[PDB]
């Protein structure tokens, strides 16, 4: 009957690879570039909008950076709708942890929950995996600031600076070249902006094609999503653009 | 019903009566209230007859399963907690069972657990359960010593069951006596209360109020 139409998403290749996982990674390779950099006093997320038009309302547009929690945010690379499904689930899990323990959820717990959801989609159900890669930028009182990365394979890793999406190899090479363990948050902003401007397939890096976020620090952290005017200001300040 | 079990230097002594009553009518006096779970574990049948018998036989089956799975004797704590979890899963459903699981293992030594239908699981040294638990408790607590010989401990358990059978109306029939060492349990005979009373009265100088 229906056996003739099953794509069998959760099967191994003769080489020992998950077909749909590799294909989702290839899909995300064509998506926008998102870069996270964790300095000693903050975390910076910078993403490039693949969808660009002169009539695109960028004021109310959020296609790359989403707030999971007052302490945790995510940069997205890939299918926006699958990412939003996973983001809704992550927000629900974070609030469940908050209701259970009366303490904000640690970053790795949420990251592992999302990664296990992704993994379960790659081992059973016969359903397609989520074509989304996440860069988590979070803060908690245990590990301080934290940068994580998760892919459709269900694997999650921790990074000082990381990039997902298009041209991740050149971005990672540039970061390894210019990253320093002692650098501050503004240095991370400059490094992320320069890496994006040097790894963008577009002509130039402008405010309309950028989303920016900073998790900074009292005993309180501030999660600031940059507005288009703030993005243009930081672009003209870091020397990438002229005004 | 009167059941007692206590651990001493020689091992564990278990002693039960054999009377089963439905009100004022003694249904039987040949009841075996010591359930031979396995050659190393014993259980006392106090409370609901069918409940205790059925669930302790099921406990023996589960112990055999554990031994087949782990190639090792099940610990007294493990079997007692199996029975406790079962009865707790059947809590409020109407089960009435106050039992003692007694065993002698290498890891735990001599060990006695009290498991009741209310889910209570208590590791102990001297336990009496049943309608005549008070009488056996009195006798034991008065004459208990860890340094008792096997003979003296057996006689003490038998005498406590005898006192219970005498005073308590719902306890009687005959006394079943077991001695549990590390190599397993040993049956030490069924003693008819009717004749045991006269024997103990003549030899002990007790029960002077009764005339014979």
């Amino acid at each position: 009957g229906s056996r003739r139409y099953d794509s069998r998403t959760t099967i191994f290749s003769p080489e020992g690879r998950l077909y749909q996982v590799e294909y989702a990674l290839e899909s995300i390779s064509h998506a926008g570039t998102a870069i996270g950099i964790m300095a000693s006093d903050g975390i910076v997320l910078a993403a490039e909008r693949k969808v660009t038009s002169t009539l695109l309302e960028q004021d109310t547009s959020t296609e790359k950076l989403y707030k999971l929690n007052d302490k945790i945010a995510v940069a997205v690379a890939g299918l926006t709708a699958d990412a939003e499904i996973l983001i809704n689930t992550a927000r629900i899990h974070a609030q469940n942890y908050l209701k259970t323990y009366n303490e904000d959820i640690p970053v790795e717990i949420l990251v592992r929950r999302l990664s296990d959801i992704k993994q379960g989609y790659t081992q059973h159900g016969g359903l397609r995996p989520f074509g989304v890669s996440f860069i988590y930028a979070g803060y908690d009182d245990r590990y301080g600031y934290q940068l994580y990365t998760s892919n459709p394979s269900g694997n999650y890793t921790g990074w000082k600076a990381i990039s997902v999406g298009a041209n991740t190899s050149a971005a990672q090479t540039l970061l390894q070249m210019d990253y320093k363990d002692d650098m501050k948050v503004d240095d991370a902003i400059e490094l992320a902006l320069k890496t994006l401007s040097k790894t963008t397939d577009s002509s130039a890096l402008t405010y309309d094609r950028l989303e920016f976020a900073t998790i900074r620090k009292d005993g309180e952290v501030y999660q600031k999503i940059f507005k288009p005017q703030e993005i243009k200001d930081i672009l003209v300040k870091t020397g990438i653009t002229k005004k | 019903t009167t059941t007692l079990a206590f651990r001493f230097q020689g091992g564990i002594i278990v002693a039960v009566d054999s009377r089963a009553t439905a009100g004022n009518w003694v249904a039987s006096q040949t009841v075996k209230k010591v359930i031979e779970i396995n050659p190393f574990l014993l259980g006392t049948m106090a409370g609901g007859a069918a409940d205790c018998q059925f669930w302790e036989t099921w406990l023996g089956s589960q112990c055999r399963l554990h031994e087949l799975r782990e190639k090792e004797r099940i610990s007294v704590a493990a079997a007692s907690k199996i029975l406790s979890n079962l009865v707790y899963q059947y809590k409020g459903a109407g089960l009435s069972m106050g039992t003692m699981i007694c065993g002698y293992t290498r890891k735990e030594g001599p060990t006695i657990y009290y498991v009741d239908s209310d889910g209570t699981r208590l590791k102990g040294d001297i336990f009496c359960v049943g309608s005549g638990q008070t009488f056996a408790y009195g006798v034991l607590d008065s004459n208990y010593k860890w340094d008792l010989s096997v003979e003296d401990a057996l006689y003490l358990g038998k005498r406590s069951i005898l006192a219970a059978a005498h005073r308590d109306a719902y306890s009687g029939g005959s006394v079943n006596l077991y001695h549990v060492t590390e190599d397993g349990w040993i049956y030490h005979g069924n003693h008819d209360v009717g004749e045991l009373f006269w024997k103990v009265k003549e030899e002990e100088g007790s029960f002077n109020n009764v005339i014979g």
Binding site: T10, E15, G16, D116, T122, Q123, G158, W159 | A78
Partner: protein, 246 residues
């Protein structure tokens, strides 16, 4: 509702999904386990690809199931977390229902049964992970080391490696592991572990990660500095051997 039989037999008698999971294990990082006289040592290779990783938050290859037993793995990281979580839950359940922590063989048997079930259920692919489970039984000082394979096969080992280039490290161990004289002290065991890894790691001590398990729940992961000291001693001895030959 998805019950597609993915792990099925081939005309020659093979279950190709299990063998492909084994190949996925082969593509994973190398891990090794060695039995001492009073300890068990687990070594694991770290991906020397990117230097931007955060060593404080990245999940380590050696994971604790209970206070006395640890589990390393080779293969898909995503599939490993499922096994680790199930193993920890079963360890707590065995503590709760038995009032005695799991034996290493029991936890290994549970993991192997989970994997075998995953090799014989509909709509489910087998785990692309092969694990090494090491520890000490409760109230026992004898070392315990076991290996579990995606097919569900589990077996005890004096010393065993699984992952990339596992054949080379296994040859090294079969040459250098004396069953008659196991590594007496912890230092000898850790040195043998690092020597086993150095035949394949080739890059440096930062890739090698070491964990030591000693009886009564004495589990400690060695810092990169101590591992580097061990590698430096081994390299100095190697130079001494190259100069004595001359």
């Amino acid at each position: 509702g998805y019950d597609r039989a993915l792990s099925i037999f081939s005309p020659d008698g093979h279950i190709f999904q299990v063998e492909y999971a084994l190949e996925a294990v082969k593509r994973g990082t190398c891990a090794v386990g060695v039995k001492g006289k009073n300890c068990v040592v687990l070594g694991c290779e770290r991906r020397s690809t990117l230097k931007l990783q955060d060593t404080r938050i990245t999940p380590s290859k050696v994971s604790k199931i209970d206070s006395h037993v640890v589990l390393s793995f080779s293969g898909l990281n995503a599939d490993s977390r499922i096994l680790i979580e199930k193993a920890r839950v079963e360890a707590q359940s065995h503590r709760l229902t038995l009032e005695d922590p799991v034996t290493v063989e029991y936890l290994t048997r549970y993991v192997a049964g989970v994997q075998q079930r995953y090799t014989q259920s509909g709509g489910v692919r087998p785990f692309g992970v092969s694990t090494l489970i090491a520890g000490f039984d409760p109230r026992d000082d004898e070392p315990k080391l076991y290996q579990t394979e995606p097919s569900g096969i589990y077996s005890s080992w004096s010393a065993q490696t699984i992952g990339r280039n596992s054949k080379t490290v296994r040859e090294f161990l079969e040459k250098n592991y004396d069953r008659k004289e196991p590594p007496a002290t912890v230092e000898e065991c850790v040195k043998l572990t690092v020597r086993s890894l150095l035949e394949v790691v080739q890059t440096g001590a930062k890739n090698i990660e070491i964990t030591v398990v000693k009886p009564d729940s004495d589990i400690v992961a060695l810092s990169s500095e101590e591992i580097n000291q061990y590698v430096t001693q081994i390299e100095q001895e190697k130079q001494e051997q190259q100069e004595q030959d001359k």
